[PDB]
Each structure stands twice: as C-alpha cells, then as structure tokens.
Design a protein around this nucleic acid. Structure first.
Ligand SMILES: *[C@@H]1O[C@H](CO)[C@@H](O[C@@H]2O[C@H](CO)[C@@H](O)[C@H](O)[C@H]2NC(C)=O)[C@H](O)[C@H]1NC(C)=O
Ligand SMILES: *[C@@H]1O[C@H](CO)[C@@H](O)[C@H](O)[C@H]1NC(C)=O
Ligand SMILES: *[C@@H]1O[C@H](CO)[C@@H](O)[C@H](O)[C@H]1NC(C)=O
Ligand SMILES: *[C@@H]1O[C@H](CO)[C@@H](O)[C@H](O)[C@H]1NC(C)=O
Ligand SMILES: *[C@@H]1O[C@H](CO)[C@@H](O)[C@H](O)[C@H]1NC(C)=O
Ligand SMILES: *[C@@H]1O[C@H](CO)[C@@H](O)[C@H](O)[C@H]1NC(C)=O
Ligand SMILES: *[C@@H]1O[C@H](CO)[C@@H](O)[C@H](O)[C@H]1NC(C)=O
Ligand SMILES: *[C@@H]1O[C@H](CO)[C@@H](O)[C@H](O)[C@H]1NC(C)=O
Ligand SMILES: *[C@@H]1O[C@H](CO)[C@@H](O)[C@H](O)[C@H]1NC(C)=O
Length: 750
DNA sequence: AGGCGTTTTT
DNA sequence: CCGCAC
C-alpha cells in the first residue's frame, strides 16, 4: 500500500513534511488519507506563490503550519527574482485549530485574517510595512509575534516600518515581540503591558528614555543592541552611529524590576551610567559586547549593585587600531557574587597577570572565562590556581609561547571539571614550568600551535590530573620512548595532523611510547601520512579506539611482512578507523591480524574494488563495517558468512551494479544497510533471503532504478517502507527516458 | 513567465 | 630513525 501523503512524508507526532519538493501549490492529498491525524504541516522552501480557501480545509486538527521561504522578496531571493504572494481571505480562517503559523520570507504587504486560536505568528522578512489594530483582529490568545527584517539592506523598503501608537493593545496575552531590522527610529508607543520579551535590535533607535518603555513592567528580556553601530567591527553593511550618540537617559530602565536580561551590544558606548542598572535586581544576563568600554572596565562602579548577575558579555570592546600593554579590571567586578560566566574575548591586551583578574579571584560561582583573541603574548597561568569554581578557560587565538619572564574515537571535554584551551597559540616547545600551578587540570587543548619538539616525558610533568590532551595540528616528532609517560591519568591523546615529521623521506619514527601509557583509551594518529620507516607494531593492553585515518597503510602493507601485525598488539581495541589509507587491496591474513576484540571497523574512502566477505569470521565481534566511498562493483564473491554479528553495514558511494541472491540472508543481526549512491537498477527481496522485515534502515536513494511498468522493486519498497528513509521523494528513477531524475512515485507503476 | 534553492545572523 | 658511548 502507498505512502499516505504523496509527494510528502509522514513523520512522528503527526507531522506531514512537504519541504523542498518544489511544489507550485498546496497538495490536497488523498481523501482516503487520515487528514484528521495531521497536527503539523511543513511546506518549507517550495514555490507556492498562491494560497487558496480550500488548501487547509480538510486538515481539521492542524496546530502548526510552516510556509516559510515560498515566495521570497527580490532582496532575499538567491538571484533577485521578484515574487508577490496572494492569499484568499479565508485561507487560514478555515483552520480554526491553528496555533502556530510561519509566513516568513514571503512577499506579502498585508496581514491576512487569522483564526482566534492562534498562539504564535512569524511574519519576518515579508514586505509588511505597517501594523494598525485591523492587522491582528481577534487574536486574544496570541503570545508570540516575530516580524524581523521587513526593511533592511537585504529587503529594503524606502522608509520605516510604521507601527501605529497603541496598535497592538488588543493582544492581551502577548509576551514575545520582535521587530529587528525594520529601519525603526523610535520604539512603538503604547505596547501590550503583558510583554515579557521585547527585541528591537539592529534598527536606528539612537535615543531612549523612560517614556519609550512606559507600562512595560512585565519585561524579563529587553534587547536594543546594534542601534548605534561601530562599523570598524562589522561583517555586513553598516551605517556609523552618528556623532554625539547614542543618548540613553539615566532612568530609562528603572521601572523594569522583573528584568532578567538586557542587551546593549554594539551601541557605541564609551561610558556606563550606574543609574542604567539601578532597580534591576533580578538581572542575570548583561550583554555589553562591541562597545568602547576598554577604559571604562578599568574604573567603573556600574557593577557594584548587580548581586544576581550570572553572565556578563564584554567581548570586542577594543580600542580602534590598538592593543593595550596592560589591563586591570575594576575593583567593582569583585562584588558580582553570582557571576558564573565572563566574556572578555577580543578586547586586545598584550599581558595577562595577577593584577588583570584580581577582583574575579574570590567570586565563588565563576565557572567559565573566555579570554580568546586578545593578542596576549605574556600570561602567568598560575593566576587561575586559587579561583574557587573554575571549569573552563578559553585562551585560544592568542600569542602565548611559554612561561612568563565522533566521540566514539575521541572524547570531548564537556563533562570534565577543569579545561584549559591554549589552541591557536605560538608554542614551539612545551616547558613544564608554564603549567606549574595547573595540576588540577583534566583537559588541555594545545592544537594549532607550532610545536616542533621531540617530546620525551619531561614536558607535562605537573599535569597530574590530566585526562585529555589534544595536540592536533602541530609538528611533534615522535621518537623518544617515554613521551607522555609523565601523565599518569592520560586517557585520550590526539596526535592528528602532525604530518610534517612523517613526510621527512629517509627519517623514520618510533611509536613504542604508546605501550608505556597504561591508562590510554583513545588515540588519534589521523591525517599524519604515515607511510614508511615506523614501528612495526603498536602495542597497548588498554587502548579502546584508534583513529588511523588519512595515512598510507597501503604503502606499509605492501612492504613485505614488516607491518602485517601492525595493529595486533592492541589487545583491547574495540574501534579502528583505517579510512583514507589509499588501500587498493587487502589480504585475508592482514584482516585476521586485527584484534579479535574489534567491534567497529571503518574503511571509508579507500580504493577497494573487491572484498572477500568470508574473512569477516576472523573478526567474531565485529558489529559495524563501513566501506562507504570505495569502488565495489558488486556485492558478490561469497556471501556474508554464517554467524557474523554484523548490525550496521554501509556500502554507499561505491559502483555496485548487482547483489547476489542470499547475500545478507545469514546476517541475522543486520539492522541498518546503506546501499545509497550506487548504480543499482533494481532492489530485490531475493538479496535478503526472506529476512528483510528485520531491517530497521535500508537506504537505497540516488540509485538509477529502472522504473518500468510492473517492476518488482516498487512492491518490495512498500513492504518495508517503514525502513526506507526519504522513500516518497529521494528514491528516484535512472531510466526509462522521461522518468530519469523523477521520483519512483511520479507515476503509478503497478 | 517564472525561474533560483538546504539560505544561521550580521 | 634524530649526541651514543666502536
Ligand atoms: C547513507 O549514506 C549516504 C551517502 O554516503 C548519506 O547521505 C550523505 O550524508 C552526509 C552526512 O550524513 C552528507 O555530507 C552527504 O552530502 C549525503 N550525501 C548524499 C548523496 O545524500 C546518508 O545520510 C546515509 N544514510 C543513513 C540512513 O544514515
Ligand atoms: C530607512 O528610512 C529612510 C527614510 O526615513 C530611507 O532613506 C532609507 O533608505 C530607509 N532604509 C531602507 C533599508 O529602506
Ligand atoms: C488569553 O487567552 C485566554 C485563553 O487561553 C482567554 O481567556 C483570554 O481571551 C486571554 N486572557 C487575557 C487575560 O488576556
Ligand atoms: C499606561 O496605562 C494606563 C491605562 O491602564 C493609561 O492611562 C496610560 O496612558 C498608559 N501610559 C502610556 C504612556 O501609554
Ligand atoms: C525580582 O522580581 C520580583 C517580581 O517578579 C520583584 O517584585 C522583585 O522586587 C525583584 N527584585 C529582587 C531584588 O529580587
Ligand atoms: C628529555 O630531554 C630533556 C631535554 O629537554 C632532558 O633534559 C631530559 O633528561 C629528558 N627526559 C626524559 C624523561 O627522558
Ligand atoms: C624504538 O624505541 C624503543 C624504546 O626505546 C627501542 O627499544 C626500539 O629499539 C626503537 N626502535 C628503533 C628502530 O631503534
Ligand atoms: C567476484 O565477482 C565478480 C562479479 O561480481 C567476478 O567478476 C569475479 O571474478 C569474482 N571473483 C571471485 C574471486 O570470486
Ligand atoms: C577468501 O579467502 C579464503 C582464505 O584465503 C579463500 O579460501 C577463498 O577462496 C577466498 N574467496 C575468494 C572469493 O577469493
């Protein structure tokens, strides 16, 4: 039986997904199909320029409708094609259940009439240039109104969006209003007193006063950032904040005593007025980024009163054309007792010392501290020792060079207690002295440095708690036998993209150190170009995962018996990646010399044209085999052998022409099978024995299927349509004639 | 005539 | 195969 909503896809929680099917108008569906069960209808990015009274009438319990991007204005059109969208008056009224509507990135100039059931309405990036009380008649349940970007550089209108005084007061439930990028020069008068979130960013409201926010006592979040911009920091087109602006009256925010978040970023602020923050005793988030407060953060008392503040963003508060020799934070910072998160990135200051952060040192909740992109070239890292609650320091993209004068394969540092990011700095060696006071560290990132050192066991001596060490994108020379043995708790070590030593033709390298790292569980040697003159064996009793991708086992395994047992000493290894190893061939003895313990083997993006499938019994525990991106011409040369434990098999992006009968039949555990992007002209139940109904996933997309009248595959795919992702739209015909490139369901074949 | 195309936010 | 110790 067919999929119930062609050409669209049924999904969980009653979602019918019609996205990206290039529809010229709204599909009505079959009258047999259960239009009652439909709670959400997605039509993202089709080309429906005309909506009608009948289009949603049969959908009697529709709660959500997304029609975004269907008829975008000239300015947001990839090729500046104009487009104006027509809506018959009862289009939406005929859906009295509708709660959420999205008409963004569509060419409409008036708001259509809408059912009183509506809770959320998104009109962003339209050409609606006015809102008067008649726009939103009888929407007494409406809580959300987003209408950003109806007049800006990418969707211009020649004037300002005019919202009439009092025009929204009819919306007594309204909590969220956003009117960004609308070329506004003043806040709309008399907005709903129910408002909790008022977002007015990237307009040109250069003046504010308490009259501009009258009766808005319910406000929890106000955003007025980007109204008076510093264009020296802009990535997009930008008009410079005029001379002697902006003007924010002292008491502007005083009646807003529920206010949790205030955003004043990119407002060209040279000085903070402590009266701006009087009365804001619920204030937990303050964004002051992209201002000119480099000098004001050394002196100001403006923070004194902010007992509840948790996140303070002071980033990109830099002085034009300069970095500072020194920076000393104001003593007032020391009263921010609730502070958890401080962003100081992009201020530009050359020295990080005891004096720089002294106020912050006894704040008991301070966990996250962002210090990146500051052109810092001296940094006493010992300053962080006695910070009571520190979990994360980002010191990346700085100029520090020393001490002062898939998580299957590589775990992240998120669940760990203390992480220092020193990546994208100028270290050429590692002096143990710079980490003397950081013995509590559990994760250290040192990637993208210039480390050209022959490490030997004496570089990281103090880091007695360190579990993860990322040294990717460096030039470590792996040669001495006791490198890293000084890190007693080391569990994960990333040595990827440290290729330059291994490119040194005629100079060999020694990986015997790996055997001396007794708790190492994860090791990456990826993208190192490892090809000749290296250790014959990797030995480790403890290792679980090894990313050996982007090397040339090809050249190693071509070189007599020298490297045939290369991975065999990894006695506990469960995951191995041998992808992009230029492998044109594999011996069955080479695969048998892999650890018996293996569960995941990747061989993606190699050049294998042949695979002796029987040799999979030499890996008893193998659950996942990835051969994507090879050149298999067929699934043949035996079948998947008896008793294999294989659950996942990916033979996508090969040149597979056919599959032998009974090929998967003996793979009793096989759940996911990817046959995508091959040259398969059919799909057959004969391939599976008669056990295809146990497959949870069967991807057969981008295959040049032969769409002939009464073809066997059509009936088959409907048998197991549960498991075929994208069946309604992305499984396509390669022949005959007219049908090439069109869906299998573009015409009924049965 | 309409087409374009997976488009975050700035 | 990179200051070892013919
Ligand atoms: C089956 O494999 C295909 C192709 O190898 C997957 O589709 C690709 O997905 C990746 C990321 O998931 C993208 O970078 C590619 O652009 C996609 N390519 C194509 C041609 O679609 C597909 O997602 C896999 N199937 C399953 C069920 O995971
Ligand atoms: C903003 O409004 C002014 C007129 O008040 C106009 O000159 C300018 O072009 C408008 N901006 C846009 C993007 O239309
Ligand atoms: C808000 O919506 C409710 C129903 O959810 C309705 O009682 C009323 O019209 C609105 N209430 C207020 C106080 O505005
Ligand atoms: C604030 O609310 C009252 C009505 O409750 C009204 O009289 C007053 O004009 C409002 N103020 C402004 C500035 O709109
Ligand atoms: C915080 O919020 C409540 C109302 O939501 C307000 O009445 C109270 O005065 C505020 N101030 C402080 C210091 O918590
Ligand atoms: C490592 O080489 C250094 C030179 O930086 C040398 O002083 C030291 O004795 C060697 N350390 C170990 C642990 O072998
Ligand atoms: C590699 O290092 C180990 C440990 O020092 C050593 O015993 C082995 O002989 C070295 N390999 C070569 C080729 O010298
Ligand atoms: C493998 O199968 C292909 C056909 O798919 C055939 O051409 C080839 O000779 C076979 N070789 C072996 C060794 O089974
Ligand atoms: C696979 O390898 C085994 C053992 O070397 C051999 O007996 C068998 O004939 C091979 N199969 C093919 C199709 O080459």
């Amino acid at each position: 039986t067919l999929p119930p909503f062609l050409p669209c896809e049924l999904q969980p929680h009653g979602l019918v997904n019609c996205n990206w099917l290039f529809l010229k108008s709204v599909p009505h569906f079959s009258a047999a199909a259960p239009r009652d069960n439909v709670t959400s209808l997605s039509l993202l990015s089709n080309r429906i320029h005309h909506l009608h009274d009948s289009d949603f009438a049969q959908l009697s319990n529709l709660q959500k409708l997304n029609l975004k991007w269907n008829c975008p204005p000239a300015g947001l059109s990839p090729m500046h094609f104009p487009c104006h969208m027509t809506i018959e008056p009862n289009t939406f009224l005929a859906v009295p259940t509708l709660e959420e509507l999205n008409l963004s990135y569509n060419g409409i100039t008036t708001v259509p009439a809408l059912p009183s059931s509506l809770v959320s309405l998104i009109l962003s990036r339209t050409n609606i240039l006015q809102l008067d009380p008649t726009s939103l008649t009888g929407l007494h349940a409406l809580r959300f109104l987003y209408m950003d970007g109806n007049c800006y550089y990418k969707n211009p209108c020649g004037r300002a969006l005019e919202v009439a005084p009092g025009a929204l007061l009819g919306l007594g439930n309204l909590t969220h209003l956003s009117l960004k990028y609308n070329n506004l020069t003043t806040v709309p008068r008399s907005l709903p007193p129910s408002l909790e979130y008022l977002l007015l960013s990237y307009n040109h409201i250069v003046t504010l006063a308490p009259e501009d926010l009258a009766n808005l006592t319910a406000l929890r979040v106000l955003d007025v950032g980007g109204n008076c911009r510093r264009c020296d920091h802009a990535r997009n087109p930008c008009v410079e904040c005029p001379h002697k602006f902006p003007q924010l009256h002292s008491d502007t925010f005083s009646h807003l005593s529920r206010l949790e978040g205030l955003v004043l970023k990119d407002s060209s602020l040279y000085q903070l007025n402590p009266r701006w923050f009087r009365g804001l005793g619920n204030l937990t988030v303050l964004d002051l980024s992209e201002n000119f407060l480099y000098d004001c953060i050394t002196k100001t008392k403006a923070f004194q009163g902010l007992a509840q503040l948790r996140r303070l963003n002071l980033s990109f508060n830099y002085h034009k054309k300069v970095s500072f020799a020194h920076l000393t934070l104001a003593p007032s910072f020391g009263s921010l007792l609730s502070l958890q998160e401080l962003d100081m990135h992009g201020i530009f200051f050359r020295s990080l010392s005891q004096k720089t952060l002294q106020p912050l040192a006894r704040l008991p909740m301070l966990q996250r501290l962002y210090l990146q992109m500051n052109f810092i070239n001296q940094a006493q890292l010992g300053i962080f020792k006695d910070f009571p609650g520190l979990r994360y320091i980002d010191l990346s993209d700085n100029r520090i060079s020393g001490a002062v004068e898939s998580e299957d394969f590589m775990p992240s540092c998120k669940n760990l207690s203390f992480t220092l990011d020193l990546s994208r700095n100028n270290l050429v060696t590692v002096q143990p002295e710079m980490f003397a006071q950081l013995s509590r560290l559990q994760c250290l990132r040192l990637s993208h440095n210039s480390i050209s050192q022959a490490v030997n066991g004496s570089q990281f001596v103090p880091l007695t708690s360190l579990q993860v060490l990322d040294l990717s994108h460096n030039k470590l020379d792996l040669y001495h036998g006791r490198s890293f043995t000084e890190l007693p708790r080391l569990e994960a070590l990333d040595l990827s993209y440290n290729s330059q030593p291994f490119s040194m033709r005629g100079v060999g390298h020694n990986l015997s150190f790996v055997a001396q790292l007794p708790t190492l569980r994860y090791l990456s040697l990826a993208h190192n170009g490892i090809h000749s003159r290296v250790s014959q064996q990797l030995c480790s009793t403890s290792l679980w995962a090894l990313d050996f991708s982007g090397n040339s086992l090809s050249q190693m395994w071509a070189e007599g018996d020298l490297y045939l047992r290369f991975f065999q000493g990894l006695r506990s290894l469960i995951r191995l990646d041998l992808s992009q190893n230029r492998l044109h061939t594999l011996l069955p003895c080479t695969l048998g010399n892999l650890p018996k313990s293996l569960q995941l083997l990747r061989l993606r993006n190699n050049y294998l044209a042949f695979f002796n499938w029987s040799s999979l019994t030499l890996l008893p525990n193998l659950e996942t085999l990835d051969l994507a991106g090879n050149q298999l011409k067929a699934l043949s040369n035996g079948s998947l052998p008896s008793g294999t434990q294989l659950q996942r098999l990916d033979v996508s992006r090969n040149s597979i022409i056919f599959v032998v009968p009974g090929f998967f039949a003996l793979a009793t555990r096989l759940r996911e099978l990817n046959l995508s992007a091959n040259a398969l002209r059919t799909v057959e139940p004969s391939w599976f024995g008669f056990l295809a109904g146990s497959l949870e996933v069967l991807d057969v997309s981008a295959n040049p299927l032969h769409c002939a009248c009464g073809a066997a595959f059509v009936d088959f795919l409907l048998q197991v349509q549960a498991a075929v992702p994208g069946l309604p739209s992305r499984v396509k015909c390669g022949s005959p004639g007219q049908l090439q490139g069109r869906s299998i369901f573009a015409q009924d074949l049965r």
